[PDB]
């Protein structure tokens, strides 16, 4: 319930930002591109291009940043455990 | 084919946008920029000339090419 009054944010894929001001330019995914504002809590730097960021759903404004995809085929092979085979 | 701001409600174009250009493509740029000078190499000087001679020159010298009536490779 605490984090029920919290939030969702549709992830987004940044096409790129612009200057003399910010307004970051973005294509979400199943939808499309929106040139939209970014969260107040994130500088104009910690948001490089090609960065799957999270987007205030309705307001459609950068809410928070994130990290990169790796698919579920590369992570499925990271060993987790370890094979008992000493020298 | 020209990016446009369109007020969501209105579909009234607000701003013109720069232009399309693949996030997969942009990764083709070069910020770090190598640091290999030439002396790093060795024995390749024949073509190293050519290497230079096919880009640098034609780039930093396009007025010399026509002054001999040619075209650059």
Residues of A whose CB is below 8 A from B27: 50
Q: What is the resolution of this structure in A?
A: 3.5
Q: CA–CA separation, B4 vs B12, rounded Å?
A: 10
- Alpha helix (H) ranges present in B1-73? 23-26, 45-60, 63-66
Q: Is A36 on the interface with B (CB under 8 A)?
A: no
Task: Classify residue A12 as left (phi > 0), alpha (psi -120 to 50) or beta.
Answer: beta
Residue A76 phi/psi, 5° resolution?
-65, -5
Which residue of A14, A28, A35 is the best one to mutate when testing the B interface, meaning the one whose CB has the most B CBs within 10 A?
A: A35
| Through-space distance between the first and last CA atoms of chain B, rounded to whole angstroms | 33
């Amino acid at each position: 319930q605490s984090e029920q009054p919290l939030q969702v944010a549709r992830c987004t894929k940044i096409i790129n930002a612009d200057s003399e001001d910010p307004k970051y330019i973005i294509n979400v995914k199943q939808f499309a591109k929106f040139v939209v504002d970014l969260s107040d809590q994130v500088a104009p730097t910690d948001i490089e291009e090609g960065m799957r960021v999270g987007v205030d759903r309705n307001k459609y404004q950068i809410h928070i940043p994130l990290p990169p995809k790796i698919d579920p085929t590369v992570t499925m092979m990271q060993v987790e455990e370890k094979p008992d085979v000493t020298y | 084919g020209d990016l446009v701001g369109v007020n969501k409600d209105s579909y009234l174009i607000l701003e013109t946008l720069p232009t399309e250009y693949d996030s997969r493509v942009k990764a083709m740029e070069v910020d770090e920029r190598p640091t290999e000078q030439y002396s790093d190499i060795g024995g390749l000087d024949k073509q190293i000339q050519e290497l230079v001679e096919a880009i640098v020159l034609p780039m930093n010298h396009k007025e010399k090419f026509e002054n001999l009536g040619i075209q650059p490779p």
